[PDB]
């Protein structure tokens, strides 16, 4: 078909970059992060919506792989919070090992330049994002180390409130948006060059973050509230504030977020949501955020990662221009990561002070006096 | 003086690379890792044996900065172990922030090539090592992420036994050397390209590690047992096994490890220890491992980081040849890091399997059946 040729051409011209995929958590569920001698299965998985053969088949240009761990359930909150930090390092480890063992398919990327160079070489640009600030164990130091490990976005919450922000699906509210810590963390995320992700956060937390952020943010996997009312979807108010922010809403394939009856959801609904946002806040502020492997079943026509050419063909079929389709595929999310990087270099170049943790005093006054007396003895030599 | 000119010339020809310095822990003790607007103090410290002015003054070519945290003291061992992991990320964070805020003095290095390029540019090559396997919280995944954060050696223990090995200063013995886990970790450390450090470990743990390791190891800060009997010093047996291993013993400035009476220790004692090892196992297997800021007071003549030219002059004065002095300064520890890297590329190139953690089952059989049924539905489309 001519439109199917056109869609294939576009997929090889520019990278389709998906905002969120939980294939690393499926590896923890199925293999327990032990992928030694499991290549046959990693190429042809017995479960889930993602494997390395179907990933090639769908012609996906890039992917933000989720390093998600669940919200802590231990009655002791100290242990649960610290356990989530260790599990985060396990999920970051298996993502890096997945990329390293399959260098012909996957290539690690942490910037706009590294995405393109990966795409030139014919590989899926493999980026990383964590899903919730519960994963850092209230450590801004840990968060900066996660950035060094290759994490390029942070979802502020998952399905639990944390010290920084409110989740959408939990009531009652704790902070009623962002906390005082949350507001201060937004500055630090902008300074370090970490992309803010507003999926899973409450409507009020989105509004506050969209006004405060000095860099553009994303919704890694969220849909439109006006088409389908849900706590996880983006309101018209926040869509307009996203436009002012210069951010991107990456549209989700979750059936509950697309239709009132989940079994009615389809590829056509995903296209309706993309066109709604593209019409009202422009096609330079819309993306694709599947949430594959964060669900059991997908919409009719978007059942797995091999189905991306049908989405590209569907957008072209409805009258979205080539240039606008390319924007929705990946050019927009590349721009946001590029602008997040530019703002960070701007603020770091100006000598902005970093957010430090509240650390305990480890020395008493007796130890400090011994140290000062010792220093003055050395000065007299 | 002619020997003082000779020592200065050598310090500018090749980098003096010190094996261990705890200046990052002094920053946690004094500043609580908040170095914003503390440049005047970081250049001229009111405490300790290390600051950025004296670091320049001593003409030090490189440094393995310690990312040490104390052995956990919480009655609950789960919390203490997990707390040590968070504190490790705080210490790695402040080390990276220290290097980043002073790029004229310090430059990050994680290899032999990066050490030289830093030294060509006139900067102190800033490498990182953790002091104890209690710091990883029994996570090999975490350990691989610490390698990604820039850690290039791991001391197997500090002053506490862990699941992998026995410390020297604690009795009774737990494992009587390395555990079964410890033996398996040695293979993983060789595979990933992590330099093994045998300081603080028991004599039997050293012997076992020296026989098992496929790459050369180091003693980041240890002295000679025959000259001064102490649990922390290296025996003649282990010195010979270090020779077969192709490793390096980096001589310590700790007064307790150099003399029976601590106040009698001197620069001359450090030179006696270097010459003893250099005479018996060759000068290509000896280094300098100060342990500055891991003590209150140093030996007479080695009171702080400005005193390295006196050590170089002292070695030349005793009749150690220029080429042998250059080896002790840094060429030896560069070689070990180069060989550790070569062995890792060798083993990784041959497709050796990595050590995985013991992870809990997160899905029951009901969830796995839903996933397999869902996959087969997709196959039929
Ligand atoms: Cl380009
Ligand atoms: Cl609007
Ligand atoms: Cl699921
Ligand atoms: Cl060279
Ligand atoms: Cl011997
Ligand atoms: Cl001390
Ligand atoms: Zn997810
Ligand atoms: Zn989600
Ligand atoms: Zn130390
Ligand atoms: Zn020590």
Residue B42: which residues within 8 A CB-CB, separation 6 or more? B35, B51, B52, B98, B102
Contact flag B137-A78 (C-beta cutoff 8 Å)? no
Rounded Cα distance between B325 and A214, Å, is 54
Rounded Cα distance between B94 and B35, Å, is 8
Please report where in the chains the tokens 């270097």 appear, as a residue.
B274
Rounded Cα distance between B47 and A112, Å, is 44
Catalytic positions of B are: 20, 22, 131, 158, 200, 221, 291
What crossing angle do the helices spanning B140-148 and B180-192 adopt, rounded to 10°? 30
Q: Which of B104, B221, B88 shows the shortest CA–CA distance to B145?
A: B88
* Residues in chain B within 8 Å Cβ distance of A34: 356, 359
Instruction: Give B79 Cα–ligand 6 centroid separation in angstroms.
Output: 25
Contact flag B148-A148 (C-beta cutoff 8 Å)? yes
The DSSP letter of residue B107 is: E
Residue in A closest to B135 by C-alpha: A86
Rounded Cα distance between B141 and A88, Å, is 10
> Known binder of ligand: residue B131?
yes
Encode A236-255: b = buried (16+ Cβ within 10 Å), e = exposed: eebbebbbebbbbbbbbbbb
* Residues in chain A within 8 Å Cβ distance of B378: 49, 303-304
Residue B58 backbone phi and psi in degrees, to 5: -75, -5
Q: Do residues B142 and B136 make contact, with C-beta atoms less than 8 angstroms apart?
A: yes
- CATH class entry, domain A1-381: alpha beta
Rounded Cα distance between B223 and B233, Å, is 5
Structure tokens at A11: 């997929």
CA angle centred on B337, ends B334 and B340, rounded to 5°: 150
Q: Which of B134, B135, B33, B68 shows the shortest CA–CA distance to A140?
A: B33
Among B100, B374, B381, pick the best mutation site for testing chain A contact (most A Cβ within 10 A).
Answer: B374
Q: Which of B272, B209, B278 shows the shortest CA–CA distance to B249?
A: B278
Contact flag A47-B367 (C-beta cutoff 8 Å)? no
Instruction: Give A324 Cα–ligand 1 centroid separation in angstroms.
Output: 17
Rounded Cα distance between A227 and B166, Å, is 63
Rounded Cα distance between B194 and B327, Å, is 22
> Known binder of ligand: residue B22?
yes
Rounded Cα distance between B303 and A142, Å, is 34
Q: Which of A316, A339, A312, A280 shows the shortest CA–CA distance to A18?
A: A312
> At how many Å resolution was this determined?
2.2
What 3-state DSSP class applies to B263?
Answer: helix
CA quadruple B117, B123, B127, B128: dihedral positive or negative? negative
Structure tokens at B88: 């490790």
Structure tokens at B48: 């300790």
Contact flag A90-B139 (C-beta cutoff 8 Å)? yes
Rounded Cα distance between B156 and B143, Å, is 12
Neighbours of B353 (CB within 10 A): 12
| Chain centroid to CA B315 | 24
Rounded Cα distance between A51 and A305, Å, is 8
Instruction: Give A353 Cα–ligand 7 centroid separation in angstroms.
Output: 32
Q: Which of A14, A188, A281, A43 shows the shortest CA–CA distance to B36?
A: A188
Which residues does residue B250 pair with via DSSP β-bridges, in sequence order? B287
> Known binder of ligand: residue A230?
no
Which residues does residue A64 pair with via DSSP β-bridges, in sequence order? A127
Rounded Cα distance between A186 and A78, Å, is 24
Please report where in the chains the tokens 């270090």 appear, as a residue.
B242
Instruction: Give A235 Cα–ligand 2 centroid separation in angstroms.
Output: 8
Distances (CA, A) of B14 to B239, B314, B323, B330, B334: 26, 17, 10, 7, 11
Interface membership of B139 toward A (CB under 8 Å): yes
Q: How far is A132 from chain B (nearest CA, A)?
A: 17
Neighbours of B363 (CB within 10 A): 15
Catalytic positions of A are: 20, 22, 131, 158, 200, 221, 291
Q: How many CB pairs under 8 A join A and B?
A: 145
Structural biology method used = X-ray
Interface of A with B in 196-255 (CB under 8 A): none
Structure tokens at B287: 């280094």
The DSSP letter of residue B225 is: T
Rounded Cα distance between A360 and B373, Å, is 52
Interface membership of A122 toward B (CB under 8 Å): no
Residue A100: which residues within 8 A CB-CB, separation 6 or more? none
Secondary structure string (H, E, C) spanning chain A: CHHHHHHHHHHHHCCCEEEEECHHHHHHHHCCCCCCCCHHHHHCCCCCCCCHHHHHHCCCCEEEEECCCCCCCCCCHHHHHHHHHHHHHHHHHHHHHHHHHCCCCEEECCCHHHHHHHHHCCCEEEEEEEECHHHHCCCHHHHHHHHHCCEEEEECCCCCCCCCECECCCCCCCCCCECHHHHHHHHHHHHHCCEEECCCECHHHHHHHHHHCCCCCEECCCCECCCCCCCCCECHHHHHHHHHHCCEEEECCCHHHHCCCHHHCEHHHHHHHHHHHHHHHCHHHEEECCCECCCCCCCECCCCHHHHHHHHHHHHHCCCCHHHHHHHHHHHHHHHHHHHHHHHHHHHHCCCCCCCCCCCCCCCHHHHHHHHHHHHHHHCC
Distances (CA, A) of B196 to A83, B130, B186, B349: 27, 11, 8, 21
Q: Which of B194, B157, B116 shows the shortest CA–CA distance to B355?
A: B194
Strands B124-131 and B62-66: parallel
Among B23, B26, B47, pick the best mutation site for testing chain A contact (most A Cβ within 10 A).
Answer: B47
| B152 sits in which H/E element | strand B151-155
Please report where in the chains the tokens 């970490």 appear, as a residue.
A194
Residue A379: which residues within 8 A CB-CB, separation 6 or more? none
Residue in A closest to B83 by C-alpha: A82
Runs of H (alpha helix) within chain B:
2-13, 23-30, 39-43, 52-57, 77-101, 112-120, 140-148, 180-192, 203-212, 236-245, 255-258, 267-281, 308-317, 322-326, 332-349, 365-379
The torsion region of residue B187 among left (phi > 0), alpha (psi -120 to 50) and beta comes to: alpha
Rounded Cα distance between A84 and A71, Å, is 8
Q: Which of A229, A226, A323, A341 shows the shortest CA–CA distance to A284?
A: A323
Which of A34, A96, A149 is opposite residue B149, by nearest beta carbon? A149
Rounded Cα distance between A102 and A50, Å, is 15
B172 upstream amide cis, omega within 30 of 0: yes
Residue A57: which residues within 8 A CB-CB, separation 6 or more? A305, A306
Rounded Cα distance between B164 and B180, Å, is 8
Rounded Cα distance between A198 and A156, Å, is 6
Q: Which of A102, A42, A97 shows the shortest CA–CA distance to B355?
A: A97
Rounded Cα distance between B238 and B261, Å, is 25
Q: How far is B226 from chain A (nearest CA, A)?
A: 31
Neighbours of A294 (CB within 10 A): 20
Which residues does residue A219 pair with via DSSP β-bridges, in sequence order? A249
Contact flag A304-B362 (C-beta cutoff 8 Å)? no
* Residues in chain A within 8 Å Cβ distance of B147: none
Which residues does residue B62 pair with via DSSP β-bridges, in sequence order? B17, B125
Which of A28, A90, A296 is opposite residue B370, by nearest beta carbon? A296
The DSSP letter of residue B306 is: G
The torsion region of residue B177 among left (phi > 0), alpha (psi -120 to 50) and beta comes to: left
Instruction: Give A212 Cα–ligand 8 centroid separation in angstroms.
Output: 23
Q: Do residues B288 and B297 make contact, with C-beta atoms less than 8 angstroms apart?
A: no
Residue A347 backbone phi and psi in degrees, to 5: -70, -40
Interface membership of A342 toward B (CB under 8 Å): no
Rounded Cα distance between A253 and A318, Å, is 18
Strands B106-108 and A286-288: unpaired
Residue B135 backbone phi and psi in degrees, to 5: -65, -25
| B288 sits in which H/E element | strand B286-288
| Chain centroid to CA A33 | 21
Q: Which of A36, A34, A123, A47 shows the shortest CA–CA distance to A296?
A: A47
> Known binder of ligand: residue B158?
yes
| Chain centroid to CA A338 | 15
Interface membership of A45 toward B (CB under 8 Å): yes
Neighbours of B78 (CB within 10 A): 16
Half-sphere exposure of B95 (CA within 13 A, CB side): 31
Neighbours of B63 (CB within 10 A): 26
Rounded Cα distance between B360 and B346, Å, is 32
Say how many Å lie between the first and final Cα of chain B, rounded. 87
Rounded Cα distance between A287 and A253, Å, is 12
What 3-state DSSP class applies to B37?
Answer: coil
What 3-state DSSP class applies to B322?
Answer: helix
Distances (CA, A) of B102 to B35, B60, B98, B110: 11, 16, 6, 18
Among A51, A83, A93, A255, pick the best mutation site for testing chain B contact (most B Cβ within 10 A).
Answer: A93
B223 upstream amide cis, omega within 30 of 0: no
What crossing angle do the helices spanning B332-349 and B112-120 adopt, rounded to 10°? 140
Q: Do residues B167 and B158 make contact, with C-beta atoms less than 8 angstroms apart?
A: yes
Residue A373: which residues within 8 A CB-CB, separation 6 or more? none
Which residues does residue A111 pair with via DSSP β-bridges, in sequence order? none
Rounded Cα distance between A341 and A190, Å, is 9
Q: Do residues A194 and A149 make contact, with C-beta atoms less than 8 angstroms apart?
A: no
Residue B282: which residues within 8 A CB-CB, separation 6 or more? B243
What crossing angle do the helices spanning B180-192 and B203-212 adopt, rounded to 10°? 50
Secondary structure string (H, E, C) spanning B39-106: HHHHHCCCCCCCCHHHHHHCCCCEEEEECCCCCCCCCCHHHHHHHHHHHHHHHHHHHHHHHHHCCCCE
DSSP string, B123-144: -EEEEEEEE-GGGGTT-HHHHH
CA angle centred on B311, ends B265 and B292, rounded to 5°: 65
Structure tokens at B296: 């209150």
Instruction: Give B190 Cα–ligand 3 centroid separation in angstroms.
Output: 37
Q: Which of B329, B314, B286 shows the shortest CA–CA distance to B125?
A: B329
Rounded Cα distance between B149 and B139, Å, is 15
Strands A124-131 and A151-155: parallel
- Burial bucket for residue B38 (CB in 10 Å: 0-12, 13-18, 19+): middle
Rounded Cα distance between A71 and A69, Å, is 7
Q: Which of B340, B343, B354 shows the shortest CA–CA distance to B188?
A: B354
Instruction: Give A97 Cα–ligand 8 centroid separation in angstroms.
Output: 23
């Amino acid at each position: 078909s001519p439109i199917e040729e056109q869609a294939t051409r576009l997929l090889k011209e520019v990278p389709l970059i998906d905002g969120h995929n939980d294939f690393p958590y499926m590896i923890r569920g199925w293999f327990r992060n032990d992928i030694n001698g499991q290549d046959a299965h990693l190429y042809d998985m017995p479960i889930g919506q993602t494997d390395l053969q179907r990933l090639q088949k769908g012609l996906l240009g890039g992917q933000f792989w989720s390093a998600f761990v669940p919200c802590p359930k231990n009655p002791d909150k100290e242990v649960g919070s610290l356990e989530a930090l260790r599990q985060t390092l396990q999920q970051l480890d298996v993502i890096h090992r997945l990329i390293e063992r399959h260098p012909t398919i996957l290539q690690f990327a942490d910037s706009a330049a590294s995405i393109w160079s990966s795409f030139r070489a014919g590989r899926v640009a493999s980026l990383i994002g964590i899903e919730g600030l519960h994963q850092i164990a209230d450590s801004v130091s840990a968060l900066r180390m996660l950035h060094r490990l290759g994490v390029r976005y942070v979802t502020l919450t998952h399905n639990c409130h944390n010290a920084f922000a409110d989740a959408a699906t939990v009531s009652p509210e704790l902070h009623g948006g962002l906390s005082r810590k949350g507001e201060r963390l937004i500055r630090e995320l902008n300074r370090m060059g970490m992309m803010i992700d507003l999926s899973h956060t409450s409507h009020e937390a989105q509004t506050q973050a969209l006004r405060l952020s000095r860099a553009p943010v994303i919704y890694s996997h969220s849909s439109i509230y006006s088409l389908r009312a849900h706590a996880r979807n983006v309101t018209d108010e926040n869509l307009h504030l996203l436009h002012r922010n210069r951010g991107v809403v990456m549209i989700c394939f979750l059936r509950e977020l697309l239709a009132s009856e989940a079994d009615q959801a389809t590829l056509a609904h995903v296209i309706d949501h993309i066109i709604y946002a593209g019409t009202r806040i422009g096609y330079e502020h819309v993306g694709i955020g599947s949430d594959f492997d964060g669900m059991l079943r997908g919409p009719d026509g978007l059942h797995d990662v091999s189905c991306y050419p049908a989405l590209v063909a569907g957008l072209l079929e409805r009258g979205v221009s080539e240039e606008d389709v390319k924007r929705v595929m990946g050019l927009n999310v590349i721009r946001v990561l590029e602008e997040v990087e530019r703002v960070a270099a701007e603020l770091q170049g100006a000598g902005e002070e970093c957010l430090c943790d509240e650390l305990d005093e480890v020395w008493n006054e007796d130890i400090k006096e011994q140290l000062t007396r010792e220093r003055e003895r050395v000065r007299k030599l």
